[PDB]
Amino acid sequence: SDPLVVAASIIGILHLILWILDRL
Amino acid sequence: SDPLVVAASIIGILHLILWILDRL
Amino acid sequence: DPLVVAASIIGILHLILWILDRL
Amino acid sequence: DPLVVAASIIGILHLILWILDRL
Numbered sequence: 001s002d003p004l005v006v007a008a009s010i011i012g013i014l015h016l017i018l019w020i021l022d023r024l
Numbered sequence: 025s026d027p028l029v030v031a032a033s034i035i036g037i038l039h040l041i042l043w044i045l046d047r048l
Numbered sequence: 049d050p051l052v053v054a055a056s057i058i059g060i061l062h063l064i065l066w067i068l069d070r071l
Numbered sequence: 072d073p074l075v076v077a078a079s080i081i082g083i084l085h086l087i088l089w090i091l092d093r094l
């Protein structure tokens with residue numbers, strides 16, 4: 001319910017996805 | 025209200041900004 | 049909240065992968 | 072939530088390491 005925590009959550013998922021794609 | 029969780033949220037957003045700027 | 053919990057697990061995985069990537 | 076707290080600690084470490092790796 002903290003918009004900062006929910007947003008950082010979504011963004012942290014986004015970040016790891018981008019890292020894996022660049023690693024593959 | 026947990027400063028640890030709030031700070032890591034802020035930091036995780038900054039980290040993705042830095043990652044994308046290195047990518048761009 | 050399962051999104052926060054999911055991001056938590058994912059962030060832990062990310063640092064492990066990044067560390068191994070530089071190891 | 073100890074999981075979210077653990078992942079908060081790790082996320083802060085992660086960026087510390089990432090910046091030092093670039094310096």
Ligand SMILES: C[C@@H](N)[C@]12C[C@H]3C[C@H](C[C@H](C3)C1)C2
Pocket residue numbers: 005008009011012029032033036037052055056059075078079081082083
């Ligand atoms: C970005 C990631 N380290 C997160 C971001 C937010 C704060 C912390 C838990 C969860 C949501 C994941 C740490």
Ligand SMILES: [Cl-]
Pocket residue numbers: none
């Ligand atoms: Cl990287």
